[PDB]
């Protein structure tokens, strides 16, 4: 299948582009404790489809600006 990544939106106030955080629950190399680490990506989308505070699926694709190589696939669970 296509190698997508789930993630919650941080902001969408840029016209046809969305910044999305990807929470990843990796463990600490030394101390062994599980940390909640973040990965803020820039992502493309046609129109202002997705708002602030909602889960989104994202695909790796062609680099369509300075940053912002990732692109939207679909929305799952809209904003509250």
């Amino acid at each position: 299948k296509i190698r997508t990544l789930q993630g919650r939106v941080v902001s969408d106030k840029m016209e046809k582009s969305i910044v999305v955080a990807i929470e990843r629950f990796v463990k600490h190399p030394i101390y062994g404790k599980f940390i909640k680490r973040t990965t803020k990506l820039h992502v493309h989308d046609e129109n202002n489809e997705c708002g602030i505070g909602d889960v989104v699926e994202i695909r790796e694709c062609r680099p369509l600006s300075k940053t912002k190589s990732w692109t939207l696939v679909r929305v799952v669970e809209k904003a509250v």
């Binding site: 600490h28 030394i30 101390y31 062994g32 404790k33 940390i35």
Partner: protein, 121 residues
């Protein structure tokens, strides 16, 4: 302690300073020498200890101990310096290498002659 505290601020290793700032991990270093003189040590000893201020090549100004009975150092005369505290003269933390350069060997030594820079009899 507390595994979360350590994630937030890890264990800082104690960066222990070097005893001998001769710099760049150097075995020995040349010195032009100024003021050769006699100094008294700390409490239980009592003596007239032979010592000289060493103007090192890199820029430092230190005191080095003149180990052995008698010496040829005076006013100037270029000498070589090795690491090693005397543990009596407070301040002095280097040793002159006897034999090398203008610093000659000790006169009439037999036992232990690499220390104190003397050839075979």
């Amino acid at each position: 302690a507390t595994v979360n505290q350590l994630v937030r601020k890890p264990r800082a290793r104690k960066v222990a300073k070097s005893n001998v700032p001769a710099l760049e991990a150097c075995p020995q270093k040349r010195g032009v020498c100024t003021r050769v003189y006699t100094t008294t040590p700390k409490k239980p000893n009592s003596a007239l200890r032979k010592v000289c201020r060493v103007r090192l090549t890199n820029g430092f100004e230190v005191t080095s101990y003149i180990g052995g009975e008698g010496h040829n150092l005076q006013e100037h005369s270029v000498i070589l310096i090795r690491g090693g505290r005397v543990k009596d003269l407070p301040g002095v933390r280097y040793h002159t290498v006897r034999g090398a350069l203008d610093c000659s060997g000790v006169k009439d030594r037999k036992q232990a002659r690499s220390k104190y820079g003397v050839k075979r009899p």
